[PDB]
C-alpha cells in the first residue's frame, strides 16, 4: 500500500549552562531507521534499522553534517523565540519540527509536510500546496515574512516532491524484507466476570505491522460503542504493535457480541466470537 518518510526534531533549552538538548529521529512508515542525540558520545547520526547499515561512510558523514546544522538552527531559534515572546533566561523551552513525504501504492508523490512548534503550540507550517505558510500568531507572521523573502517554500518543495520521495523509494527497496511485508494481527478474546451479573469481553490484536488498525464490537450484528473501552495502539518493542478493545455485557449473553478487526495484512476483515 502507501508509505511515508518522516523526520522528527526536538530541542529543549538548558538554562544556566550550555546548549540545548537536541534529539532527531527518522522513520519510514512505523519503522525508525536513524537517530541523533546531542548527549550521546558518538556525535554521529546512528543507524537503527539493519537495512540502513548498507549505506556507506559518505551517507553517514552527510547525515551527520545536516543533523548538526539542524540543531544549531534550533539553538538560534530558542534564543530568538525567547525575545519574540518576551520570556526570561530562566525558563526551559522547546522547539519541534516535523517533515516528510507520503507516497501512494505506486510510490508516487501524494503529499508533503513541514511543520514547527514552540512549547507544544502550532508556530508555522507549510500548507499542502507547498507554496505558502500558516503562521499561527504575529511572531510567526514575522518568521513567515522572512521565509517568503528567502524562498524557503521553494527549497522545501523540491526536497519534498523530489529528494524525499527518491530516498523513500530506495529505503523501501533496500528494506523490502520487512518494509514491504505486512504482519497480520494475531487475534484472540478473553473473558472476565466483574460480578454475578456483569461480564467483560476483551478482543486483542497482537504482533501487527503497520500500526494502523481498526477494532470494533457488534451486538446482534450492529455496532456497539456504548460500554466499550479502546486502548491507544501501542508498540510491543520488537517492531510490532498491540491493541485491544473491550465491552461489558450481561453475564450469559456473551454470544450476541462479535469483534471486528480490519488491517492491511488481512485480505478480508476478521470476526471473533466467545465460545
Amino acid at each position: 500500500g502507501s508509505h511515508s518518510m518522516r523526520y522528527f526534531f526536538t530541542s529543549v533549552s538548558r538554562p544556566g549552562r550550555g546548549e540545548p538538548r537536541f534529539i532527531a529521529v527518522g522513520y519510514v512508515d512505523d519503522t525508525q531507521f536513524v537517530r541523533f542525540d546531542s548527549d550521546a558520545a558518538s556525535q554521529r547520526m546512528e543507524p537503527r534499522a539493519p537495512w540502513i547499515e548498507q549505506e556507506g561512510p559518505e551517507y553517514w558523514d552527510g547525515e551527520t553534517r545536516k543533523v548538526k546544522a539542524h540543531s544549531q538552527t534550533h539553538r538560534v531559534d530558542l534564543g530568538t523565540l525567547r525575545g519574540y515572546y518576551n520570556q526570561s533566561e530562566a525558563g526551559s523551552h522547546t522547539v519541534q519540527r516535523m517533515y516528510g513525504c507520503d507516497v501512494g501504492s505506486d510510490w508516487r508523490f501524494l503529499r508533503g509536510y513541514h511543520q514547527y512548534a514552540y512549547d507544544g503550540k502550532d508556530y508555522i507550517a507549510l500548507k499542502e500546496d507547498l507554496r505558502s505558510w500558516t503562521a499561527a500568531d504575529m511572531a510567526a507572521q514575522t518568521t513567515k515574512h522572512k521565509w517568503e523573502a528567502a524562498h524557503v517554500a521553494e527549497q522545501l518543495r523540491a526536497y519534498l516532491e523530489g529528494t524525499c520521495v527518491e530516498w523513500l523509494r530506495r529505503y523501501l527497496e533496500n528494506g523490502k524484507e520487512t518494509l514491504q511485508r505486512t504482519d497480520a494481527p494475531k487475534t484472540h478474546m478473553t473473558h472476565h466476570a466483574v460480578s454475578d451479573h456483569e461480564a467483560t469481553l476483551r478482543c486483542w490484536a497482537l504482533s501487527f505491522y503497520p500500526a494502523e488498525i481498526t477494532l470494533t464490537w457488534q451486538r446482534d450484528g450492529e455496532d456497539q460503542t456504548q460500554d466499550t473501552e479502546l486502548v491507544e495502539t501501542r508498540p510491543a518493542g520488537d517492531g510490532t504493535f498491540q491493541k485491544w478493545v473491550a465491552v461489558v455485557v450481561p453475564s450469559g449473553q456473551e454470544q450476541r457480541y462479535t469483534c471486528h478487526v480490519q488491517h492491511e495484512g488481512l485480505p478480508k476483515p476478521l470476526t471473533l466470537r466467545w465460545e
Binding site: 523526520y7 545536516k66 508556530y123 508555522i124 522545501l156
Partner: peptide
C-alpha cells in the same frame, strides 16, 4: 535523507 536546504532560522 535529511533536507540540505530550507531549514532556516525563525
Amino acid at each position: 535523507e535529511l533536507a540540505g536546504w530550507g531549514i532556516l532560522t525563525v
